[PDB]
Design a protein around this nucleic acid. Sequence first.
RNA 1: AGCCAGGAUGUUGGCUUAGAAGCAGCCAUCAUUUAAAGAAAGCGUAAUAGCUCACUGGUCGAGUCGGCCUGCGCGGAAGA
Lengths: 38, 175, 69, 333
Amino acid sequence: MKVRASVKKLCRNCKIVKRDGVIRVICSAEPKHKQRQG
Amino acid sequence: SRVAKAPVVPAGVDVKINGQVITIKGKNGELTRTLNDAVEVKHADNTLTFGPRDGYADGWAQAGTARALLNSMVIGVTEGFTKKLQLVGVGYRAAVKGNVINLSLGFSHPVDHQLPAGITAECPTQTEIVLKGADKQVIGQVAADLRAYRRPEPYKGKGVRYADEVVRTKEAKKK
Amino acid sequence: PPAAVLLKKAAGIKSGSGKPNKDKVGKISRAQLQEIAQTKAADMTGADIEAMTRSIEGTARSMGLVVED
Amino acid sequence: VDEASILVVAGDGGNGCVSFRREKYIPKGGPDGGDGGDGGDVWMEADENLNTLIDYRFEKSFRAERGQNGASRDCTGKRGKDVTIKVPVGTRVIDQGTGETMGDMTKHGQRLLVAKGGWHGLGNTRFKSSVNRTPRQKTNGTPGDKRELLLELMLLADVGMLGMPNAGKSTFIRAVSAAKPKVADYPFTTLVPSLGVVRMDNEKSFVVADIPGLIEGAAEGAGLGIRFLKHLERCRVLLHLIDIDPIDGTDPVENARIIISELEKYSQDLATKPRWLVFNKIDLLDKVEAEEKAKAIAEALGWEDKYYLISAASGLGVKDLCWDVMTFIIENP
RNA sequence: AGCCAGGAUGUUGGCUUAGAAGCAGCCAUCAUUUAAAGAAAGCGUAAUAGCUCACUGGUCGAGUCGGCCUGCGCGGAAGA
């Protein structure tokens, strides 16, 4: 997780999950990539 | 959709209508209930039909759900998905000892948890555990709690995994 | 023996170009090619003799070998 | 494999006083307090493990402190600091600035200071010649430390095993070691090699490093490929596997001459230094015969680069010797 | 959307490289089989292999997939 005011999927091993006001980009292959907010 | 407006239910399973409680009754499991908040129950007893109670736009969110939940009750009283709960790694207890199991990492306290019905087990092994089905939700929520007492650790992948396979040797490249 | 192999052996060069087909190193005769296509006919799941001929010609052309009697 | 050169920066100079003395009674004073900062230097630490990848991290090098000022309530400001650098698994230190090597090691828990500071801000007193009034300053000179250091592991991690297409390096290291092999990671501008841990039977353990990714032996011509083969040849210590069994497929006498000659050809100095020969496939030998041959080849070299033994057997002072080759590799040029 | 597959065959095309042969770099990227099957996307592998898959038939069986402009909302959002 990191502080980022831009959401867009990085690889297809990021998928965009919306938990309201925080939007993560964890995927099965790579939950390495992760965001906090959005 | 083609599932929130697209519906059978044999004779072994029967239903006790309420406004968005679907109470099922049947065999091998009965008296099962799960609620929504925006579906009318239409009776049919041949897969009951669903959609908005009064007109809502969250009522097909609830219709496809209520659909599958009904169907999950059907499968539930014919035993659901949880039927195992393995764990990768050796030298760690994981047999069934009555209602309690045990688990180790070299733990200086027993690690165990009792069994309610609907998830009863017994194995002859300390690696595999053979559980029982029941209502799909119920078994799944207790199934999670089991594995949660030592989630996977991935450098060799050891750590008590779920009913499904959720391990991967997703190491940090180090030993 | 592959078609790929067999046409390089018949053309007498064992190496390819640095850029195959945009550069050629040797050439391979349709007489060789027809017969290799017959041996490799067997190894094909083809329905006819022509089928094999095209498949083996296609292997020559891409390894930087000309296809010409 | 890669070798690296770090740029390390320490703290830096102040920023002089913006100050006036404030009174309700008396209108405005001068500056009290002043500048701030200064900054420490570069040091080095040497370590057995790694065992947290901070070299597959890398961000783009070593940064540190800018100075201070203060003003509320008549203030100066503090100092900057020293930066210290960690590697995966030992380093031998050189500095591009000296152009040469300082300390010689890959001896762990050995630290060395490459020392400078004396960075200062521009204060009100600097301008002064006992006439000046400069109440307002907020200003800095100086840049914090700059030096290019040069680190080399001694590589692939400290020692690089360079077989031949008869090799079997990992299996033998596991036989001779009750220690596990790790996958190591290093500060490489290339892929990051396979690490194998060696027992030094002293209640310390040392690691030996083998071919990029899966092994192939450098002599075969691939390290995992030409690219890898280029990563692999770089190690300062190179190791020569033979199968000192009656079998080697390319016979042991011949093999030993060809590997030893190629290393000589490349640099005679490498043969004459603490670069090793390691006798292997003694998982097919009891090591009394192996030991003799290991020892004859070694002595016949006519210089330092004698014999290492890998793959366990006997107790002819052999455990001591295994530990000794590793010690010799550690002591470094 | 999903599901069954074919998933073949010259073939795993070659240079480079021991192996880089759809998928490091460099270039080919042709052709066959059938109602269908790409010298093959990614993962994975030095690279292939494999693994799955845009490729394409069958299946469930009817509407469905993305652009363009637009109303009004949302996240972004820390102080004694």
